[PDB]
Paper text:
The eukaryotic guided entry of tail-anchored proteins ([name]) pathway mediates the biogenesis of tail-anchored (TA) membrane proteins at the endoplasmic reticulum. In the cytosol, the [name] chaperone captures the TA protein substrate and delivers it to the [name]/[name] membrane protein complex ([name] insertase), which then inserts the substrate via a membrane-embedded hydrophilic groove. Within the membrane targeting stages of the [name] pathway, the homodimeric ATPase [name] (also called [name] in metazoans) adopts closed and open conformations in response to nucleotide load and interactions with other pathway components, allowing binding and release of the TA protein respectively. However, the cryo-EM structures and native mass spectrometry of hsGet1/[name] and scGet1/[name] show they form a 2:2 heterotetramer, which is stabilised by [name] and interfacial lipid binding and is important for efficient TA protein insertion.
Author numbering:
A (entry chain D), B (entry chain C): 191 to 291, 1005 to 1169
C (entry chain A), D (entry chain B): 24 to 205, 214 to 344
The structure:
Amino acid sequence: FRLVGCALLALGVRAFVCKYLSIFAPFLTLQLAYMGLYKYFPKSEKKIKTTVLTAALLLSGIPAEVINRSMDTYSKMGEVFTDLCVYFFTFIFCHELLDYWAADHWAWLLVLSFVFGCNVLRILLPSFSSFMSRVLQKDAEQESQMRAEIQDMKQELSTVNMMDEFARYARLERKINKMTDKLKTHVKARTAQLAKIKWVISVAFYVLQAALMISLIWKYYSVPVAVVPSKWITPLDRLVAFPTRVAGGVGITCWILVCNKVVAIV
Amino acid sequence: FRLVGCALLALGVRAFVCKYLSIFAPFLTLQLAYMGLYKYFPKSEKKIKTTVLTAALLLSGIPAEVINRSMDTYSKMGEVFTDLCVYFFTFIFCHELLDYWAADHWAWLLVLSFVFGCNVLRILLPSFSSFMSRVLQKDAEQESQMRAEIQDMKQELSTVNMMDEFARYARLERKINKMTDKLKTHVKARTAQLAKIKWVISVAFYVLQAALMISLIWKYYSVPVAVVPSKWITPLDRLVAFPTRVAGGVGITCWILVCNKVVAIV
Amino acid sequence: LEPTLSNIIEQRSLKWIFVGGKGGVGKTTCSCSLAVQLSKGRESVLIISTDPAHNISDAFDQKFSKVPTKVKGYDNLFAMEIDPSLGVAELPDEFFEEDNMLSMGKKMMQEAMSAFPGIDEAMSYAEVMRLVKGMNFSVVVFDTAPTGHTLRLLNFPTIVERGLGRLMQIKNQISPFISQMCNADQLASKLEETLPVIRSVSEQFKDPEQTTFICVCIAEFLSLYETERLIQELAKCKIDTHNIIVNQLVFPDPEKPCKMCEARHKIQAKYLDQMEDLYEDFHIVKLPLLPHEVRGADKVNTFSALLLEPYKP
Amino acid sequence: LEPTLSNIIEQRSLKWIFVGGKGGVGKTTCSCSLAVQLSKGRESVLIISTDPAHNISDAFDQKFSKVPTKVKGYDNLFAMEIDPSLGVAELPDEFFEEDNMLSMGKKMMQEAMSAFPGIDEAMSYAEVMRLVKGMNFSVVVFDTAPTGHTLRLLNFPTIVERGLGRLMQIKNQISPFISQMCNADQLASKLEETLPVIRSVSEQFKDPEQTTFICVCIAEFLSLYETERLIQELAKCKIDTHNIIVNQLVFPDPEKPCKMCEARHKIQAKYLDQMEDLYEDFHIVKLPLLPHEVRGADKVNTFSALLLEPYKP
Ligand SMILES: [Zn+2]
């Protein structure tokens, strides 16, 4: 349901796109969030599920209400951060539109292409999972034969009696149980191997994308990227003007965060 | 994953927004869909789940492959219809933007307000479910007392032995089973009542929104709504110009379909 | 109440008599003697054996098959052993495990176009029922297997019923669609001729006046508890049950010949006191223990005689 | 192999002897006689009774409690009845039903801040184990209840173990966070003093050289099948089992006094042939049936004597 509010806020931002009648642009977002909270006041549907990390902190004596408010305000600041990010994205959109009717434009296009490429490669990593799908196919024949053996043993046990020949019935039941336990162990081993492979490939992807990001920063740390008049976004201008008095290293994380958010919650 | 393609197509459309260099605007969408299909060719992830309506049609002798192609092309035309809808929405956006730098504008705003109001009322119908939440609270006391009775019987049965007093143990087990069966019957009755109430309120909502829609048509059937130059969207202009040579009754269903799609798949 | 099985014999409206009970109890001999006793009053009795060990073959020292065959020494009795019954009753183990009301039909259709193993079960069961009803037997005595319960199977195809009702509802819509876009008949056919017999037998099963269940146990906590669970499960399915028969009773003579006879008698006395306290609304048929040398038709006749009238030394 | 229970007595490395078995078998008398026999070789024996009917009280015609109390007529034996054991073993029925490896800890914590009923079970069990280990008994003989199995409970807190390991891992991170944003100790404390005894007893349970299980059954298909299932479930949990004791055996004399004695002897002979064929790697202890007038300490001594050396008339 949170994405419903995100979409409503995004359509509101796109309605206020490139609108300079009101100087207080981030405040416009503040009342957007206020309206969202007012609408959520009778529509506060949420799902809380038990996790593992919270167990240790609960055992540390922290009050449960304190932990609940911590997590829900953490969520709240998460979506307000994403919403401010898309707000800045729409302001950039206004900027190149007024430019249409300029190294900033090429820088914007290049950083956009880089972030979309990283994100699509991350999302097609499951398509890159063929290198382990081949091992799955290799083990498939073993699994098939050793389940055919299960079926043969089960039908043979169904053939034999149970009253006057309990010895053979019990021995065959023992064999069936042992082979099914072996099947479960093999399945769990396959699952663990796949999970470990996914984890290691994911951390490799994270390190390579971090290297690409830092290379992009070293390339464009001394180059202006997103130039806006100061008094337009002056409440937070000093924060966004991290490198060389321009919207740089905050813009990059805005782009990557909003793209990851949309392609994840999508 | 389908919403990923929808978002990619939407961002492509918004990249081609208000771009009149190429006359073949719907074709631009045609190659958009072609690129989507080409990208999905190695990325055709889908989930097919067994339903009830397909059972009767499978029992009617229709080949399974025929049914699969029927359903997947039905899906495909569904998303291409939604994508053409958002394409027309972006063209309208271009139209009022060029108007910014006009009864069509008030008509657009009014139909938008009507469709958003209908959709938000439909989505807050669960908040309107208080009229049956009160009945749930009314039955809650009965449920609580008759589960407390279950707990009392269970603990008393745990107290009694089983070997030397099997008669009392079996009688108490019978009573516990009967009371738990009564609990299950009451729960199923509550679920059926709630489902029937939701169904009847939903059909009432559908009929009232249909009445509102047809009233809107009777109000604006003879009034132009969305005026565009013919040669811009001329491949499908004759279809969209349903009333009085203007984008009317197709525009309304575009708006309602895209809004329902976003607020449902959201 | 009554320590005999005369209520079954005097109820001439019975048409499906089941004899259940798990464990080491010799319930096949009890059911065969019940069928022998029934043969004295009815015009034709059938004995269906769903057990895999073919016990009624040894009881009558004859060889039976999947068709009803006359047993020697009797003019009304017929016997039949159907291993296909257990073979097709093992298959719905998944349905028994889930026992749902919406998804079991989904599973059945999924296996239908995946492996087709369930509608084949329905055909086999319908064929057995059609043979039973076409030979026109007055009563049929089932020897249910000690493991499993195929009686509930008849309550499953109700999902098939309302699915076919939805099929009839969409019948007027598929034909115009078929004409718009343009074997089919054999499936709906075989469903149409295999449904009515299933419905007749299922309606007869739920009728207490033409279907009864006799639970066979012995004087012991384990068998008593198993039969209590069986009775509770049977009543949960709305299936009549009125008689239980206890086997391997000792009944020592007043001569006090053996200490161990009185020890076992005390144990069994405790268990029967528990049973009678629990089952005041049942018919407790106490069947003693017969000699090892008395095996075959003689023991069947003896058990039938003791079923007709109570045994007390 | 061997028809006696001497392997248990001669194994002086045993410290946890469990006596299991469902049904109507008089396993309490067998376990009490085993404890009496053990008292002749060890320095101190304890008899824990987890059954609700308090059978060892009737066996020794004494009244016991939740603390170890000297039994009359013996100098080494001690007895204790702990109904709290079954009271806290009924509670983890949900964990027994699921028997998962990831979500059971989630359920335990959910009930912990919702009702706190499970850590209380852990404390009760740890207290019982601490009392047992602090009184320093050579051997402890458990009379496991005929229904349920609390032995697997010790394998559950491994989720608690690695959760506490993650707690130690995040210990260096919570404190700086606590300083940044700014009872706690009692929970981690009671966990820290209730874990080691649980781990000691669980490690002793899985060691075949200091933990054994004796399964008690009778010559019958139902009890034989129940004990076969019990043995399979016990082996699935990697728990040692080497002896089974069959009760209520007749052993008729060659005088042929009663026909029913030989009939029951034939039935039991079939069942024991099946058992010995199935259990060539077990110790089959055949215990006969004692008089009804022989009840109490005399029957306990008789069963102990027949456990030490095989009985054959
Ligand atoms: Zn005798």
